[PDB]
Design an enzyme around this catalytic site. Structure first.
Site, short mmCIF file in Angstrom:
data_model
loop_
_atom_site.label_atom_id
_atom_site.label_comp_id
_atom_site.label_asym_id
_atom_site.label_seq_id
_atom_site.Cartn_x
_atom_site.Cartn_y
_atom_site.Cartn_z
N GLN A 1 0.82 -1.21 0.00
CA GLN A 1 0.00 0.00 0.00
C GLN A 1 0.86 1.26 0.00
O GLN A 1 1.88 1.33 0.69
CB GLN A 1 -0.95 -0.01 1.20
CG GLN A 1 -2.01 1.07 1.16
CD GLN A 1 -3.03 0.91 2.26
OE1 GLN A 1 -3.51 -0.19 2.53
NE2 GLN A 1 -3.38 2.02 2.91
N1 LIG Z 1 -6.68 -13.58 -11.53
C1 LIG Z 1 -5.63 -13.59 -10.71
N2 LIG Z 1 -5.69 -12.92 -9.51
C2 LIG Z 1 -4.63 -12.92 -8.66
C3 LIG Z 1 -3.47 -13.61 -8.99
N3 LIG Z 1 -2.59 -13.45 -7.98
C4 LIG Z 1 -3.16 -12.68 -7.02
N4 LIG Z 1 -4.43 -12.35 -7.43
C5 LIG Z 1 -5.42 -11.53 -6.70
O1 LIG Z 1 -4.92 -10.25 -6.34
C6 LIG Z 1 -5.50 -9.83 -5.12
C7 LIG Z 1 -4.43 -9.30 -4.16
O2 LIG Z 1 -3.61 -10.35 -3.68
P1 LIG Z 1 -2.45 -10.04 -2.61
O3 LIG Z 1 -1.63 -11.28 -2.36
O4 LIG Z 1 -3.03 -9.50 -1.32
O5 LIG Z 1 -1.56 -8.93 -3.36
P2 LIG Z 1 -0.43 -8.08 -2.60
O6 LIG Z 1 0.55 -7.54 -3.61
O7 LIG Z 1 0.27 -8.92 -1.55
O8 LIG Z 1 -1.23 -6.86 -1.93
P3 LIG Z 1 -0.57 -6.05 -0.71
O9 LIG Z 1 -0.76 -6.84 0.56
O10 LIG Z 1 -1.26 -4.72 -0.59
O11 LIG Z 1 0.91 -5.84 -0.97
C8 LIG Z 1 -6.24 -11.02 -4.53
O12 LIG Z 1 -7.63 -10.80 -4.63
C9 LIG Z 1 -5.81 -12.19 -5.39
O13 LIG Z 1 -6.85 -13.13 -5.57
C10 LIG Z 1 -3.40 -14.29 -10.20
O14 LIG Z 1 -2.38 -14.90 -10.51
N5 LIG Z 1 -4.48 -14.28 -11.06
#
Ligand SMILES: Nc1nc2c(ncn2[C@@H]2O[C@H](COP(=O)(O)OP(=O)(O)OP(=O)(O)O)[C@@H](O)[C@H]2O)c(=O)[nH]1
Ligand SMILES: [Mg+2]
Lengths: 189, 120
Positions: free
Chosen positions: A69
């Protein structure tokens, strides 16, 4: 002081420190989870950080995933210390913020606390129809023309767990081969 | 040996003494004793664990050196470190392996969780 230096001198040989960063939503925590074979169906956006100790190819890998974030990115460099490999995760579908992905990366490559880490870029969410091609993400981020670090691009889908291994497998080849030349030049001098 | 290989080994003596003392448990007890509250029992770590963790380390080692001279006056931590920090690979013992336990973050989180659990 003492304890901080002590640990950095007798540091474990096959223990690797992996820092996972990248803009919010990218899928960082999704990767970590869908690596241990944990449930991805429960992941809420991370405001802090997850540490998932995990073994692979003789190594044990201490992987830190820090919340992406915008208001949390200032505190990102509290985890720069002792980073062996930097995993930059990209939401290859959100092309609108790809502009932002370039800025934050180019500011990481010049941190001197990360100066040694090997750069793995995860072009995630490749399953999505709106997902940009790795090469279009390569000219974006201005990935090549960076004389700072050793890097590789890897288009992946974190939901299916596709291409997550080919990236980590490469990362070790680089890190270990960098530690090869460590011993090589050490003992011969 | 011979000449101030003693100094070092005589300091090692206390890198058991000091940290095996029940007075070491106090300063920990006391430091932990001001954030039981702010340690959640979830796998995701708070962004504020790190600044507390760094205060913890700079208190352990800050205590260790102000205890090493409560016994060895004319002791220099910066001189001890430098030399130790290479020219006596009579390191490596089941001695500092103990001393870098405090650098382990998860072992810190776990023992910190045990404290909030205890007073609840
Ligand atoms: N369609 C699709 N969605 C994905 C994929 N990988 C992650 N997502 C989606 O992206 C969203 C965020 O996932 P997070 O793991 O929380 O992403 P993040 O980068 O860690 O987010 P932060 O905690 O803010 O850093 C979730 O709703 C997941 O389902 C993917 O490979 N394909
Ligand atoms: Mg997350």
């Amino acid at each position: 002081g003492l304890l901080t230096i002590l640990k950095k001198m007798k540091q474990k040989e096959r223990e690797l420190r992996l820092l996972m960063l990248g803009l919010d939503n990218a899928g960082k925590t999704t990767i970590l989870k869908k690596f241990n074979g944990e449930d991805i169906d429960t992941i809420s956006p991370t405001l802090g950080f997850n540490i998932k100790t995990l073994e692979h190819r003789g190594f044990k890998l201490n992987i830190w995933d820090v919340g992406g974030q915008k208001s949390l990115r200032s505190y990102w460099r509290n985890y720069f210390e002792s980073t062996d490999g930097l995993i930059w995760v990209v939401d290859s579908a959100d092309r609108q913020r790809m502009q932002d992905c370039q800025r934050e990366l180019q500011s990481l490559l010049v941190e001197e606390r990360l100066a040694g880490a090997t750069l793995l870029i995860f072009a995630n969410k490749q399953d999505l129809p709106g997902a940009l091609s790795s090469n279009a993400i390569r000219e974006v981020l201005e990935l090549d023309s960076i004389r700072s670090h050793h890097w590789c691009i890897q288009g992946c889908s974190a939901v299916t767990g596709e291409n997550l291994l080919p990236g980590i497998d490469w990362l070790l080849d680089d890190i270990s081969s960098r530690i090869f030349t460590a011993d090589l030049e050490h003992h011969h001098h | 040996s011979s000449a101030s290989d003693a100094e070092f080994d005589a300091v090692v003596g206390y890198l058991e003494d000091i940290i095996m003392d029940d007075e070491f448990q106090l300063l920990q007890r006391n430091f932990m004793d001001k954030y039981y509250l702010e340690f959640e029992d979830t796998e995701e770590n708070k962004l504020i664990y790190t600044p507390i963790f760094n205060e913890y380390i700079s208190l352990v080692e800050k205590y260790i050196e102000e205890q090493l001279l409560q016994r060895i006056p004319e002791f220099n931590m910066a001189a001890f470190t430098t030399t130790l920090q290479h020219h006596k690979d009579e390191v490596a013992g089941d001695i500092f392996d103990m001393l870098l336990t405090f650098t382990d973050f998860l072992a810190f989180k776990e023992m910190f969780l045990d404290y909030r659990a205890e007073k609840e």
